[PDB]
Amino acid sequence: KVQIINKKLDLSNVQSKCGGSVQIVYKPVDLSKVTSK
Amino acid sequence: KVQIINKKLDLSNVQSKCGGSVQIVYKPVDLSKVTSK
Amino acid sequence: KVQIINKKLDLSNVQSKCGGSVQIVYKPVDLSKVTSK
């Protein structure tokens, strides 16, 4: 039982809670490869 | 039982709580490879 | 039971609490490889 995993998550704008601020992402460019050989 | 894992997460704008500030990401460029051989 | 893990996380803009300031990332360039052989 062999199990190979490649992961890369992209979360941009996230707020969370359990129980002013300025956040800017200006022009992101992504050339990023997910290769499995 | 063999299990190979490659991980690389990308979270840009994150706030969190459990119970002014300025954050700027200007033009990020990403050439970053996820190779599994 | 063999288990090989490669990890590299990217968190850019993070605030957190449990119970003015200026943070600038200007033009980050990332050529960084995740290889598993």
| Cα separation, B31 vs C12, whole angstroms | 16
| Cα separation, C9 vs C6, whole angstroms | 10
Specified resolution (Å): 3.3
| Cα separation, A8 vs C18, whole angstroms | 28
Contact B10, A11 (CB under 8 A): yes
Rg of chain C taking only CA atoms, in angstroms: 16
Q: How far is CA B25 from CA A3, A12, C15, C24, C25, in A?
A: 36, 11, 14, 6, 5
Given CA atoms A36, B3, B8, B14 in this order, what sign does their dihedral have? positive
Residues in chain A within 8 Å Cβ distance of C12 = 25
How close, in Å, is residue A17 to chain C by CA atoms? Answer: 10
